[PDB]
Nucleic acid binder design. Structure first.
Ligand SMILES: [Mg+2]
Ligand SMILES: [Mg+2]
Ligand SMILES: [Mg+2]
Ligand SMILES: [Mg+2]
Ligand SMILES: [Mg+2]
Ligand SMILES: [Mg+2]
Ligand SMILES: [Mg+2]
Ligand SMILES: [Mg+2]
Ligand SMILES: [Mg+2]
Ligand SMILES: [Mg+2]
Ligand SMILES: [Mg+2]
Ligand SMILES: [Mg+2]
Ligand SMILES: [Mg+2]
Ligand SMILES: [Mg+2]
Ligand SMILES: [Mg+2]
Ligand SMILES: [Mg+2]
Ligand SMILES: [Mg+2]
Ligand SMILES: [Mg+2]
Ligand SMILES: [Mg+2]
Ligand SMILES: [Mg+2]
Ligand SMILES: [Mg+2]
Ligand SMILES: [Mg+2]
Ligand SMILES: [Mg+2]
Ligand SMILES: [Mg+2]
Ligand SMILES: [Mg+2]
Ligand SMILES: [Mg+2]
Ligand SMILES: [Mg+2]
Ligand SMILES: [Mg+2]
Ligand SMILES: [Mg+2]
Ligand SMILES: [Mg+2]
Ligand SMILES: [Mg+2]
Ligand SMILES: [Mg+2]
Ligand SMILES: [Mg+2]
Ligand SMILES: [Mg+2]
Ligand SMILES: [Mg+2]
Ligand SMILES: [Mg+2]
Ligand SMILES: [Mg+2]
Ligand SMILES: [Mg+2]
Ligand SMILES: [Mg+2]
Ligand SMILES: [Mg+2]
Ligand SMILES: [Mg+2]
Ligand SMILES: [Mg+2]
Ligand SMILES: [Mg+2]
Ligand SMILES: [Mg+2]
Ligand SMILES: [Mg+2]
Ligand SMILES: [Mg+2]
Ligand SMILES: [Mg+2]
Ligand SMILES: [Mg+2]
Ligand SMILES: [Mg+2]
Lengths: 63, 136, 386
RNA sequence: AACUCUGGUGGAGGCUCGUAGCGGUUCUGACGUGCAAAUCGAUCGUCGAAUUUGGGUAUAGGGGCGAAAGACUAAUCGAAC
RNA sequence: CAUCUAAUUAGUGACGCGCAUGAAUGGAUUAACGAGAUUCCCACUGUCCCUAUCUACUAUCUAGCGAAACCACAGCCAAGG
RNA sequence: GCAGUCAAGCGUUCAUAGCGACAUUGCUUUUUGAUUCUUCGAUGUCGGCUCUUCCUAUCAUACCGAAGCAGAAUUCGGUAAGCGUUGGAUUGUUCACCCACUAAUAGGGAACGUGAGCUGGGUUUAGACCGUCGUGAGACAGGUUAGUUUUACCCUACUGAUGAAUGUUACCGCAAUAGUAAUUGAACUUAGUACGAGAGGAACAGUUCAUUCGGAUAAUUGGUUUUUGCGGCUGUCUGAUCAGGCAUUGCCGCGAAGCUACCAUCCGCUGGAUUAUGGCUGAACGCCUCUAAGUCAGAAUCCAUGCUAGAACGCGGUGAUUUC
C-alpha cells in the first residue's frame, strides 16, 4: 500500500491514479493524471509550471 | 502462447495487430519485426489477430541482415507502448513497440536485449528474462 | 446460398423484448429456496445506488500470480438505510401458480409509504388506511383472524417492506414498497416474525454478511431510442455507403417475406430490468460510524463519502453495502440486493476479504486528496484563511 | 592565339505556382416527386493566349457546321421545327 | 525463369515457331509534360481492427401553409394445389 | 456429388480392421445438360460487404462403439446442428492457389437469401486503342481504358411507443405463453507416471488464466469537449488601459460533467429426463441373450431451476372510494 510521487508535479499518487511511463532508457515516470502526463509529453519543464512542487520550492513558496 | 510459455498471463491490452512493425530489441542483426500473425489468436470475422506484451508472434524482418530478411520467424513482444492495466491498478505503457526473435520453443535467437522488458513477458519467457537487463 | 463466413449472432435473444421496464423498481422473480431449519430472515433487501469507488486489498488466491499481493478493485456502494416492515402477504399454491390469499398491514404507516399510494399527495385528504387502522380496535380481532388465515393456509409468506427514503439524500420523499420472501421455517413462525416486526425496521447487517455473493436486481440506465449499431453491436457499414452506415444492411431474405424477430433493429436502449448474479459483499458498513472509509490498515478517520459528496447522488449518512464490481442501474436508483439462489463454492466465493484502503478522493474531478486534512497538509495555508 | 570563365544587367516563353475568368477530374458527396428537365459543396484542370467574351454579320435541313463525339444546329439530331 | 512479398491470376526484367507482333494502316526509343491506366516504397491517416464522442441543420412535437407518386379490391401466416 | 448390396481380390496369414474389381440398386438438387411451363405495357442481371435464419451429408467441441486400438498420434462408425468454423498476398471473380493462426478453419439452402441495404470491380448504351476476320460498313462467349445505380410519407412484417373499454383509482403480486446462452483453449499439477525393449508418452480429479459471445457499469485508464471552464496566440475592430466583438465552434494547451472502449472494469446458475453406448434381471429358444415384460448409468441434446416480456379481451390480494 504505497503512495507514489508524480514525476512532473510531485503529486501524491494513490493506487489506480494516473499512468506509468517507461522511457527508452528505462526511467519510470509516474503521473497522477493526464494533465501532468500531457505537460511532460509537451517537454514542459516542471520548474516553470507555476503550480508544481518543484516550482514552489524553487521559488520558496510556502516555507 | 502454446509452447515454451512458462505459466499463464493475465490479459494485457492488445496494441499490436497484424501489420504492426515493432523494433527488434535483441542483437540478432534485425532492425524491425513486422507482425504477420499472433500465436494463440482468436477466430473472429474481420478481427485482426492482435498481439500484446509477452505474446509470441509470427514475424518477418523488413530491415536488417539479408540472412534474416524474407523469412517467417517467431518473435516475442517485449515492449508494448499501449497502455495496459496490471492487477495492482497501474496503467502503464512503454515508449516503443519491441520484440525479440525466438524459435518456437521460446529460446531466444539473440544474446542481449537492448532496453527495458515488461514483467509479464519476462515471467512468461525465462529465456527473455535471462538475457534481459532491466525488467520494467 | 450460405453465409460464406460464419460469425456469431449479434446480441442475446433471451434478453428480449428490449423495451422499457414496467417500473423503476425491478421485481425479484425468484427468491432463494426455503430452508425450513434456519431462522426466519429476509432474502432480499432494498437500497439506493450511491456510486462506485476504489479499494485495495491483498488477494488470497493460491496459484495465482497475485497471491498475497495487493489488487486494486472497483466497488459499488449501495446506500442502504433500514427498511420498515409494514405488512405480510400469504401465498397459496394453486394449480395455476401462487396466489396472494391475504395481506395484513401494520397499524401505523409512515407518510413515506403512504405517499406510495398517492399520485397527488399534496391535494389529497390522506385518507389511506384510515379504516384499516380501525381494525386494530379494542383487541385486534380482525387482524388476528387474517394472520390466523395466513398461518392456516399460505405455503409462502412474503413481508411488505418499505425504504426509508428521507434518510437518503434524494428529493423523492416517496418510499419504495416491496415484498421480500421470508425464508426460515414454519409458516406460523414466519407470520409471527412479521407480526413482531410490524412498524419495526430491519437493518442490512441482519440480512447480508461480508464475503457473501449477492444478486443485484435493478432497471438499467435509460438511453432513449437507439440505433442498431450501439443497441445491438452490429458492424458499421463501409464509408462509401448511401443512406447511412449505422444500420443493419440486410434485414432478411426474400423468403420468409417478413422481417424476423431475430433481426437486430433500432429502438429503446437501456431502462431494462436486469438481474446480475455473484457480486461479492466487501463491506457491510454502519451509519452510526465514522471510520466507514477506514480499514484496519488505513486508520484515517474518514467516512465512505468522497470529498465533495458522491457525484450526482449526495452523501451517505446510513448503512451501506460495498459490493464488488458493477451492478445494474445508475446512481440514485432503487436496487434490490438478493441472497444467492445457489450455494457457490468456487474459491472466488468463500474468500475472506479484508480491505486495506478505500478511495475517498473526489469523483467530481481527478481528485488528489483523500481527506480535507490531507489537502491542508499538502497544500499548506491558502488566501482564504486556511 | 583561336577563344573560355565569372558577376551583374535585361525581361523572353502557345513557360510555371495561383486570383478573377473559362472549364468540369474525383467524391461515383449532396440533391435525385430537386434551388435546378443538370444545380449545390469540397476537390480539381487552366489562367496572357490555338485565351475568354458582348454586339454586328455569314452559312439552313439530306442542308449547315464539326481541333471529329455522329457532336452541335432554340431542353428537338444516326437528319430540327 | 528471375525479382518484388510471409504468401502475388498483380508489377517489373528476361525467353520466344509470335492462336493472330512489325515498319508513315508507321517499327523501336525518347527528356519534358498528363485531373490518363498500373505496380511498389516512405510519410500519413477512423480505410480498417472497432468503434466512440461533440457541433450545427434536419428529422420529432406545435401554430400556419400544404402537395405528389401510386391506387381492381385490399392487406397476418404455414403447407397444398 | 453421396450412399448401399454381392464379394474375385489387396491387406505378412486373413474376403468384409481399412479397402474392394466385374456387376447391380438407389439418394439429393448444392454443378452441368434436357424442356420452354410462368414472366417481353421493367420480377433490376454476377461478385463482394452487411445481417438473420434453416438443413445435416459432423471439420471442431461433448459422450461413446471398432481397429492391423500397447502409449502417443491416427483410421472407420454412432447419438448429435447445442455451439463455433478465421487473418491475409494475387485475382472483379464464385472457384483456385499460397502464407499463417486455430479446437476447427465442414458442406449446403433461404428468388444461384440479401442493389427503394450498399458497392459498381465483372458482363456493359453511346467514346477510344490493338490483334485476327471482312473489299467495306462492320464482327469477335478476344484483350484494354472511361462510362448518371432513382422513390417509401402507404399497407403488412419487424423494432420500440402510447392507448378506449373492465364501477373508479392506487399499490403489491401470480405467470399462461413466447424467447433464452454461454463457448472453447492453454500453462501448472497428475507426470516423464500409466503403456513401452526403447524411442517416445497419456488421461480423470485439482488449480490459474485465456478465446469467442453476452448483459451491465464508468471507481480507475483512454477517447470525446459548446463547460466556448481557465490560460495562451494570430489578424482586425472598440483612441490607449481594462474588458471585449468578429474570424460560419478562429487556432493551441489543459479541461470537470455526461456519453463511452475487450482501449476500461464487473458479472455470466444447477437439477431432472434422455439419445448413442455400456449394463442388471430375464424369457422367447429348459442353454444363451441389454429386451421381448421390467430396469441402471449416460451427450455440448431435451425440459425445468435461473433470466427477459407479461395475455393491452388471463388472474389474485389490498388501500381509498366524492352532499352541506
Ligand atoms: Mg472482411
Ligand atoms: Mg457455414
Ligand atoms: Mg448463430
Ligand atoms: Mg419465479
Ligand atoms: Mg438520454
Ligand atoms: Mg447518442
Ligand atoms: Mg426501428
Ligand atoms: Mg456500479
Ligand atoms: Mg468522475
Ligand atoms: Mg501557360
Ligand atoms: Mg499554370
Ligand atoms: Mg480560378
Ligand atoms: Mg464574366
Ligand atoms: Mg453522385
Ligand atoms: Mg431524398
Ligand atoms: Mg419546389
Ligand atoms: Mg445533304
Ligand atoms: Mg461511333
Ligand atoms: Mg439541343
Ligand atoms: Mg499488391
Ligand atoms: Mg513483361
Ligand atoms: Mg492538357
Ligand atoms: Mg428542426
Ligand atoms: Mg424542424
Ligand atoms: Mg374485391
Ligand atoms: Mg402464405
Ligand atoms: Mg405485359
Ligand atoms: Mg419494377
Ligand atoms: Mg422486387
Ligand atoms: Mg446424423
Ligand atoms: Mg464422428
Ligand atoms: Mg434442431
Ligand atoms: Mg440455433
Ligand atoms: Mg441472388
Ligand atoms: Mg431487396
Ligand atoms: Mg439500387
Ligand atoms: Mg467500369
Ligand atoms: Mg412524420
Ligand atoms: Mg442451458
Ligand atoms: Mg457494451
Ligand atoms: Mg465572411
Ligand atoms: Mg472568439
Ligand atoms: Mg465484451
Ligand atoms: Mg442374464
Ligand atoms: Mg437401450
Ligand atoms: Mg423393454
Ligand atoms: Mg436412469
Ligand atoms: Mg435447480
Ligand atoms: Mg396484463
Amino acid at each position: 500500500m504505497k503512495v507514489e510521487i508524480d514525476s512532473f508535479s510531485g503529486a501524491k499518487i494513490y493506487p489506480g491514479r494516473g499512468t506509468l511511463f517507461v522511457r527508452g532508457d528505462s526511467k519510470i515516470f509516474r503521473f497522477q493524471n493526464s494533465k501532468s502526463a500531457s505537460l511532460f509529453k509537451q517537454r514542459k519543464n516542471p520548474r516553470r509550471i507555476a503550480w508544481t512542487v518543484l516550482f514552489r520550492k524553487h521559488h520558496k513558496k510556502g516555507i | 502462447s502454446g509452447n515454451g510459455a512458462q505459466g499463464t498471463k493475465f490479459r494485457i491490452s492488445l496494441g499490436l495487430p497484424v501489420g504492426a512493425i515493432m523494433n527488434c530489441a535483441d542483437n540478432s542483426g534485425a532492425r524491425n519485426l513486422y507482425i504477420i500473425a499472433v500465436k494463440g489468436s482468436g477466430s473472429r470475422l474481420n478481427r485482426l489477430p492482435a498481439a500484446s506484451l509477452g505474446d509470441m508472434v509470427m514475424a518477418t524482418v523488413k530491415k536488417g541482415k539479408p540472412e534474416l530478411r524474407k523469412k517467417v520467424m517467431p518473435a516475442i513482444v517485449v515492449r508494448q507502448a499501449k497502455s495496459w492495466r496490471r492487477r495492482d491498478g497501474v496503467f502503464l505503457y512503454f515508449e516503443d513497440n519491441a520484440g525479440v526473435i525466438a524459435n518456437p520453443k521460446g529460446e531466444m535467437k539473440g544474446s542481449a536485449i537492448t532496453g527495458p522488458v515488461g514483467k509479464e513477458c519476462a515471467d512468461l519467457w525465462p529465456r527473455v528474462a535471462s538475457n534481459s537487463g532491466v525488467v520494467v | 446460398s450460405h453465409r460464406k463466413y460464419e460469425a456469431p449472432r449479434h446480441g442475446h435473444l433471451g434478453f428480449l423484448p428490449r423495451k422499457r421496464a414496467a417500473s423503476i423498481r425491478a421485481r425479484v422473480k425468484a427468491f432463494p429456496k426455503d430452508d425450513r431449519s434456519k431462522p426466519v430472515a429476509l432474502t432480499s433487501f432494498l437500497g439506493y445506488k450511491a456510486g462506485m469507488t476504489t479499494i485495495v486489498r491483498d488477494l488470497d488466491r493460491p496459484g495465482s500470480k497475485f497471491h498475497k499481493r495487493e489488487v486494486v478493485e472497483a466497488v459499488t456502494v449501495v446506500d442502504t438505510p433500514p427498511v420498515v416492515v409494514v405488512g405480510v402477504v400469504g401465498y397459496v399454491e394453486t394449480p395455476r401458480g401462487l396466489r396472494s390469499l391475504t395481506t395484513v398491514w401494520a397499524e401505523h404507516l409512515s407518510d413515506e409509504v403512504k405517499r406510495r399510494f398517492y399520485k397527488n399527495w399534496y391535494k389529497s385528504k390522506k385518507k389511506a388506511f384510515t379504516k384499516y387502522s380501525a381494525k386494530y380496535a379494542q383487541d385486534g380481532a380482525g387482524i388476528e383472524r387474517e394472520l390466523a388465515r395466513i398461518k392456516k393456509y399460505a405455503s409462502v409468506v412474503r413481508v411488505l417492506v418499505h425504504t426509508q427514503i428521507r434518510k437518503t439524500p434524494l428529493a423523492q420523499k416517496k418510499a419504495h414498497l416491496a415484498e421480500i420472501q421470508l425464508n426460515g421455517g414454519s409458516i406460523s413462525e414466519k407470520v409471527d416474525w412479521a407480526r413482531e416486526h410490524f412498524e419495526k425496521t430491519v437493518a442490512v447487517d441482519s440480512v447480508f454478511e461480508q464475503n457473501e455473493m449477492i444478486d443485484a436486481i435493478a432497471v438499467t440506465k435509460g438511453h432513449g431510442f437507439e440505433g442498431v449499431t450501439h443497441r445491438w453491436g452490429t458492424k458499421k457499414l463501409p464509408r462509401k455507403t448511401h443512406r447511412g452506415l449505422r444500420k443493419v444492411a440486410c434485414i432478411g431474405a426474400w423468403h420468409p417475406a417478413h422481417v424476423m424477430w431475430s433481426v437486430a433493429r433500432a429502438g429503446q436502449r437501456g431502462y431494462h430490468s436486469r438481474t446480475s448474479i455473484n457480486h461479492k459483499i466487501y463491506r457491510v458498513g454502519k451509519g452510526d460510524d465514522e471510520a466507514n472509509g477506514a480499514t484496519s490498515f488505513d486508520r484515517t478517520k474518514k467516512t465512505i463519502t468522497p470529498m465533495g459528496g458522491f457525484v450526482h447522488y449526495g452523501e451517505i449518512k446510513n448503512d451501506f453495502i460495498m459490493v464488488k464490481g458493477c451492478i445494474p442501474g445508475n446512481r440514485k436508483r432503487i436496487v434490490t440486493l438478493r441472497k444467492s439462489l445457489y450455494t457457490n463454492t468456487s474459491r472466488k466465493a468463500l474468500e475472506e476479504v479484508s480491505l486495506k484502503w478505500i478511495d475517498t478522493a473526489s469523483k467530481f474531478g481527478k481528485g488528489r486528496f483523500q481527506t480535507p486534512a490531507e489537502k491542508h497538509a499538502f497544500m499548506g495555508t491558502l488566501k482564504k484563511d486556511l
